[PDB]
Ligand binder design. Structure first.
Ligand SMILES: *C1=NO[C@@]2(*)=C1(*)(*)C(*)(*)(*)=[C@](*)(N(=O)=O)[C]=[C]2
Length: 250
């Protein structure tokens, strides 16, 4: 299948954290209008990540999903502290196509299966944050704060076994960098799973997307490179097509 380009939007109290540089937008920090604009210029799927610190979070995420579903016609994922089946269920029913889970899945891997039982494997995305520690790829939880001691190799196999649809592979070793995706990490994971692998962290220029796809990624996700317009989405897709990558053009 076609390689996929995803945009992730980090949100807090209903706003896109640090906004965007699209002057054409009425409100460049509105996640709905920004998401809609991305869907029009060639983003394939959207990810909405909420960090509303406690209290209003549940209602905020549900209202976000409802507003997004009304306006956009490409698939989207919602994530950020989804801890149980009922939370995931209400977000999917309100409009999300998929839910994206990390810490709660590591702590209770049956959560993957429970969501998939009702909504299908295709509705369950597991985000795996990994980092090199003493020469092994280790799985990290709590926004990179906790080394679980679980090997990346073991967790990838378990995630597929439990019934996840896709894996987002986030390299903590590339957080905040613009040097490229962690292609070594992608190549390490590729033979271990039949699931779609979505690369995250490290993108800085168009050539990094090509590199990630050569490494075996099925999709590439980014955020600030798009929001601050370091990479244009249409230019990226034209570049990838030029060099033989199967991507969807309009
Ligand atoms: C995934 N792994 O750690 C995370 C993940 C997502 C979000 N988020 O804001 O959706 C936060 C931490």
């Amino acid at each position: 299948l076609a390689k996929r380009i995803d945009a992730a939007l980090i949100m807090k109290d209903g706003r896109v954290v640090k906004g965007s540089n699209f002057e054409n937008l009425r409100d460049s920090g509105d996640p709905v209008e920004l998401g809609k604009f991305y869907s029009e210029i060639g983003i394939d799927e959207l990810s909405f990540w909420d960090i509303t610190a406690s209290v209003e979070k549940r209602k905020t995420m549900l209202e976000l999903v409802e507003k997004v579903a009304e306006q956009i016609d490409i698939p989207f994922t919602v994530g950020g502290g989804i801890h149980d089946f009922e939370t995931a269920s209400e977000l999917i029913l309100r409009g999300a196509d998929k839910v994206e889970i990390n810490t709660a899945a590591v702590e209770n891997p049956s959560l993957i299966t429970q969501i998939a039982q009702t909504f299908g494997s295709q509705a369950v995305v597991v985000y795996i944050a990994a980092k090199r520690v003493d020469g092994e790829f280790m799985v990290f939880t709590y926004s990179g704060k906790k080394n679980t001691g679980i090997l990346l190799r073991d967790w990838v196999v378990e995630v597929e076994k439990r019934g996840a649809g896709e894996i987002v592979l986030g390299s903590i070793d590339r957080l905040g960098t613009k040097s490229g995706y962690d292609t070594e990490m992608i190549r390490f994971v590729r033979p271990l799973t039949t699931l779609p692998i979505i690369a995250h962290r490290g993108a800085g220029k168009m050539e990094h997307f090509l590199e990630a796809f050569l490494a075996g990624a099925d999709a590439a996700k980014a955020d600030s490179v798009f929001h601050f317009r370091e990479i244009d989405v249409r230019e990226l897709k034209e570049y990838l097509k030029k060099h033989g990558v199967n991507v969807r053009l309009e």
